Design an enzyme around this catalytic site. Structure first.
Site, PDB file in Angstrom:
ATOM      1  N   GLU A 151      40.656  26.597  37.227  1.00 46.19           N
ATOM      2  CA  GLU A 151      39.460  26.464  38.042  1.00 46.19           C
ATOM      3  C   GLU A 151      38.549  27.680  37.922  1.00 46.19           C
ATOM      4  OE1 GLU A 151      40.603  23.547  39.053  1.00 46.19           O
ATOM      5  OE2 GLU A 151      38.545  22.847  39.366  1.00 46.19           O
ATOM      6  N   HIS A 187      42.534   6.450  38.304  1.00 47.70           N
ATOM      7  CA  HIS A 187      41.187   6.553  37.748  1.00 47.70           C
ATOM      8  C   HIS A 187      40.594   5.181  37.448  1.00 47.70           C
ATOM      9  CE1 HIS A 187      41.439  10.902  37.533  1.00 47.70           C
ATOM     10  NE2 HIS A 187      42.630  10.783  36.976  1.00 47.70           N
TER      11      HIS A 187
END
Ligand SMILES: *[C@@H]1O[C@H](CO)[C@@H](O)[C@H](O)[C@H]1NC(C)=O
Ligand SMILES: *[C@@H]1O[C@H](CO)[C@@H](O)[C@H](O)[C@H]1NC(C)=O
Ligand SMILES: *[C@@H]1O[C@H](CO)[C@@H](O)[C@H](O)[C@H]1NC(C)=O
Ligand SMILES: *[C@@H]1O[C@H](CO)[C@@H](O)[C@H](O)[C@H]1NC(C)=O
Ligand SMILES: *[C@@H]1O[C@H](CO)[C@@H](O)[C@H](O)[C@H]1NC(C)=O
Ligand SMILES: [Cl-]
Ligand SMILES: [Zn+2]
Lengths: 596, 96
Positions: A356, A486
């Site tokens: 991140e 997803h």
């Protein structure tokens, strides 16, 4: 006078106004991440309503502009991004039907609960499933639980998926696309750039080339995994036939990470663990972020602005408040970025923080760019840029250098073999599943095959390409592979394949620039400011120019390649091929677990 | 820097900056124009299709990071022209 000036003025207007609204929406999202009270729930409700209304109105007023009378490439791509109507191209009743069905999907998946033969137990995707698969080694439990969950989810979403195929095909046809497959392929469409033009089928040819150049490695790894499964349980698997779907290690065959305890080739050797060392030093989240920033400074990337430490939350808020802390970072902008994730004393936390942080650096790289270009050149660049830094930090030379691992140890042969096995089973096990899911969705949108043989054809191809067998045969009355998250929230999977390919290409080229010799998986990107500037050369680009040109600014090639995949696993592949001298290679699709 | 003094939570929406006019500017000029800018060769009442308001919003929050935090900036202009000088730079004093 000309349409170009009007387009530029409207893009400046859209830039500013969409910046205001997106900043408000992203601050509301961070409020969701921190304090989940009903007050900020409603606040986010109105903020998202206003942002969606503003975006829709701006797009509608942008529809009056024509793409033929404008020559500037940046402005052209900006108007093209503006003209993506999406749901509004179709009728209001159909659009509200579609959004209601998507809300139905969200509710059903979030509330999916399956009952055992004794209905006293209540599971729901989280209390079990993951932990059942990753902690229990029983065949009966996994078979029964997965079969029941798949059956109930299919029973509750089959006709929803059918009407989704119909409505998405109609939307694509109404938006000048042959199929929703072409709609999803439209992200990679690049025109008006000489030596950089790519159609909707060029990526298909590239993917087929990757298949052709990847198949033997995956077949050999499947043979090794199935052979280890034989050694663990000999009476439930055939020496030549493919393995049942429920023997891949995770929920739906996406990851083989959980198979470590059964697939380690040498269990006596100690894995690379710095956990006990960071309790030796009493490591904290502030120190972990300072170490990440030291690594990022060592690659010439900029420091941590004071706003990060001031407003970003780096530890759990006790028990007074609850925070969803999946490692995530949205694009606030104007130099404002922040991180919310649970900081535990772990090593996967090291990977998540590094990933991140790379995401944050890539996000801030294109800060000066306009709104429609304030993103990765494609959907996978951000995740690839995040993952490269974590992969570099996972090497033991970095741990030796930065003090977490003491100087007085040397790299051991079987330990590094186990580590490379970790990095293999945690990555290359997702690529075939991504390929199956994306291709099946592709021809679902194409409509080449009638409704009546979907599951049969899908599972036959699974057995034929990756050897994924149904432990219980199913007819056209099932929707098992649509149960993933997803696909269950309408997200493309090409992002993961592109992420893996791009991270391997970037690591290859960056290490080549950084001049490290020997096995490539041991290289590090540190004290290599030339390589840091090379990386920034693509980081600052955003979406102004094609992602293929952005890749050319690193590797020098304009297309995806399998060479990093082949080269990163040269010694692993050598060891598997020298150990495969007395084992079967390949699979037979005729064998099924219920055919005796 | 002026963030505590100027930027306010929930949005600071007092500062307005223009973006578009008919032509270029001249240095040291006042162009406060409450005339809605027009484009597309279609003069309009304003605030519609291809009707742009020149002034935009200085979105300011106290959490903005450096690059767009509200900065208080003042420019001091001098002229070296022959005239009776009135703004003289001070003197100093010492012991006896
Ligand atoms: C923190 O949570 C409370 C509710 O417990 C809420 O009223 C407040 O607005 C939240 N603060 C922020 C900054 O989101
Ligand atoms: C294209 O857009 C860029 C960025 O706004 C600008 O610098 C350039 O002058 C434009 N080119 C033309 C031909 O309008
Ligand atoms: C680190 O672990 C503990 C202290 O956390 C202690 O044994 C010693 O200081 C270190 N070494 C080993 C081998 O544990
Ligand atoms: C980079 O150089 C610094 C300066 O001493 C050193 O501490 C660090 O270990 C180096 N990084 C490496 C060798 O990866
Ligand atoms: C690997 O290194 C070890 C040293 O720890 C050595 O004994 C061994 O012969 C080397 N080769 C293999 C194949 O293990
Ligand atoms: Cl599956
Ligand atoms: Zn993330």
């Amino acid at each position: 006078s000309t349409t170009e000036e009007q387009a530029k003025t409207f893009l400046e207007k859209f830039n500013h106004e969409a910046e205001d609204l997106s900043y408000q929406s992203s601050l509301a999202s961070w409020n969701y991440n921190t304090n989940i009270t009903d007050e900020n729930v409603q606040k986010m409700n109105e903020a998202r309503a206003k942002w969606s209304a503003f975006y829709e109105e701006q797009s509608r007023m942008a529809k009056t502009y024509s793409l033929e009378e404008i020559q500037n490439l940046t402005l052209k791509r900006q108007l093209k991004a503006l003209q993506h109507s999406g749901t509004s191209a179709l009728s209001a009743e159909k659009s509200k039907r579609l959004n209601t069905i998507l809300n139905k999907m969200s509710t059903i998946y979030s509330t999916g609960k399956v009952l055992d033969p004794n209905t006293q137990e209540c599971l729901a995707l989280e209390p079990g499933l993951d932990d059942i698969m990753e902690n229990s080694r029983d065949y009966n439990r996994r078979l029964w639980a997965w079969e029941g969950w798949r059956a109930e989810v299919g029973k509750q979403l089959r006709p929803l998926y059918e009407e989704y195929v119909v409505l998405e095909n109609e939307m694509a046809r109404a938006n000048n696309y042959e199929d929703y497959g072409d709609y999803w392929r439209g992200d990679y469409e690049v025109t008006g750039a000489g030596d950089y033009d790519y159609s909707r089928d060029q990526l298909m040819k590239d993917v087929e080339r990757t298949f052709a150049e990847i198949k033997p490695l995956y077949e050999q790894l499947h043979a090794y995994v199935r052979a280890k499964l034989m050694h663990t349980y000999p009476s439930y698997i055939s020496p030549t036939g493919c393995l049942p779907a429920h023997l891949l290690g995770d929920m739906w065959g996406r990851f083989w990470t959980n198979l470590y305890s059964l697939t380690v080739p040498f269990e006596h050797k100690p894995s690379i663990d710095v956990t006990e060392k960071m309790e030796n030093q009493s490591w904290d989240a502030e120190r972990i972020f300072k170490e990440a920033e030291k690594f990022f400074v060592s690659i010439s990337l900029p420091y941590m602005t004071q706003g990060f430490w001031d407003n970003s939350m780096l530890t759990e808020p006790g028990d007074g408040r609850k925070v969803v802390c999946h490692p995530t970072a949205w694009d606030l902008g104007k130099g404002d970025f922040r991180i919310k994730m649970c900081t535990k004393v772990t090593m996967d936390d090291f990977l998540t923080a590094h990933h991140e942080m790379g995401h944050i650096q890539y996000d801030m790289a294109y800060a000066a760019q306009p709104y429609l270009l304030r993103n990765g050149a494609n959907e996978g660049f951000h995740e690839a840029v995040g993952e490269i830094m974590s992969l570099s930090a996972a090497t033991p030379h970095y741990l030796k250098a930065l003090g977490l691992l003491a100087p007085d140890f040397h790299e051991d042969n079987e330990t590094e073999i186990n580590f490379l096995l970790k990095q293999a089973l945690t990555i290359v096990g997702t690529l075939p599943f991504t390929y199956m899911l994306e291709k099946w969705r592709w021809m679902v949108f194409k409509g080449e095959i009638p409704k009546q043989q979907w599951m049969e054809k899908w599972w036959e191809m699974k057995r034929e390409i990756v050897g994924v067998v149904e432990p219980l045969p199913h007819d056209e009355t099932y929707c098992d592979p649509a149960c993933l998250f997803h696909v269950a929230e309408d997200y493309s999977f090409i992002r993961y394949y592109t992420r893996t390919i791009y991270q391997f290409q970037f690591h290859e080229a960056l290490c080549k620039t950084a001049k490290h010799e020997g096995a490539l998986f041991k290289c590090d990107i540190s004290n290599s400011t030339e390589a840091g500037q090379r990386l920034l050369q693509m980081l600052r680009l955003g979406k102004s120019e094609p992602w293929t040109l952005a890749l050319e600014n690193i590797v020098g090639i304009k297309t995806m390649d399998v060479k990093p995949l082949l080269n990163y696993f040269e010694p692993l592949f050598t060891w598997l091929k020298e150990q495969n001298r007395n084992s079967f290679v390949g699979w037979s699709t005729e064998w099924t677990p219920y055919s005796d | 820097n002026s963030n505590k003094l100027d930027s306010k939570h929930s949005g600071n929406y007092d500062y307005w900056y223009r973006l578009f006019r008919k032509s270029k500017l001249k240095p040291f000029e006042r162009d406060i124009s409450t005339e809605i800018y027009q484009a597309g060769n279609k003069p309009c009442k304003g605030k519609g299709p291809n009707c742009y308001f020149p002034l935009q919003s200085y979105g300011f929050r106290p959490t903005y990071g450096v690059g767009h935090q509200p900065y208080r900036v003042v420019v001091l202009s001098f002229e070296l022209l022959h005239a009776p000088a009135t703004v003289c730079g001070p003197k100093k004093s010492t012991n006896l």
